[PDB]
Amino acid sequence: LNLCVLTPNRSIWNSEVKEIILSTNSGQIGVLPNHAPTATAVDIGILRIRLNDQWLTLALMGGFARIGNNEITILVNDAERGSDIDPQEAQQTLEIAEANLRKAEGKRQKIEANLALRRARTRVEASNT
């Protein structure tokens, strides 16, 4: 399907593909050749492309997707290439994020750290992938 992945600064994976799959609020769905017209938000979690040969992770830290007539319009909030992140590096940043999540008190700072840990487990996750 025509994945038009689009950060709020770049059209990320504008490659059309064989397969993609997504972190649903049900937990994950998969895209489907001529899927439903549907739309889905994705939490801070790795999207994936099981394109023609490769199944690999698209590390998004938030966003939505208009799944039209085999027409993915997947606009993330911040979609890293999980291939690109160094596993040790983002694992270390994840370690610092879990530690600072143990450090930050106070509702804005606590939520900032927890969502930072959310995107950081996402970062480490496709970094582990």
Partner 1 sequence: NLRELRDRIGSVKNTQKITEAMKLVAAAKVRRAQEAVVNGRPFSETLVEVLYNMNEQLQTEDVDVPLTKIRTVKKVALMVVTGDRGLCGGFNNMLLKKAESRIAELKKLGVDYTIISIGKKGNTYFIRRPEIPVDRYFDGTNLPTAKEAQAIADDVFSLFVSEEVDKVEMLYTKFVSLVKSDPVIHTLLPLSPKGEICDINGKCVDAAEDELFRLTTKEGKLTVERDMIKTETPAFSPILEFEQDPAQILDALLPLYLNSQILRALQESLASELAARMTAMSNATDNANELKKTLSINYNRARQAKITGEILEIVAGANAC
Residues that bind partner 1 (CB under 8 A): 6-11, 24-26, 29, 36-41, 61-64, 66, 68, 73, 75, 77-78, 107-109, 111-112, 115-116
24 versus 100: smaller Cβ distance to partner 1: 24
Sequence-distant (6+) residues with CB within 8 A of 59 are 46, 47, 79, 80, 81, 82, 85, 122, 123, 125, 126, 127
For the CB of residue 53, give the shortest distance to partner 1 in the complex, in Å: 27
54 versus 103: smaller Cβ distance to partner 1: 103
For the CB of residue 97, give the shortest distance to partner 1 in the complex, in Å: 12
For the CB of residue 24, give the shortest distance to partner 1 in the complex, in Å: 7
Q: How far is CA 111 from CA 27, 117, 121, in A?
A: 21, 9, 15
Closest C-alpha among 44, 33, 60 to residue 113: 44
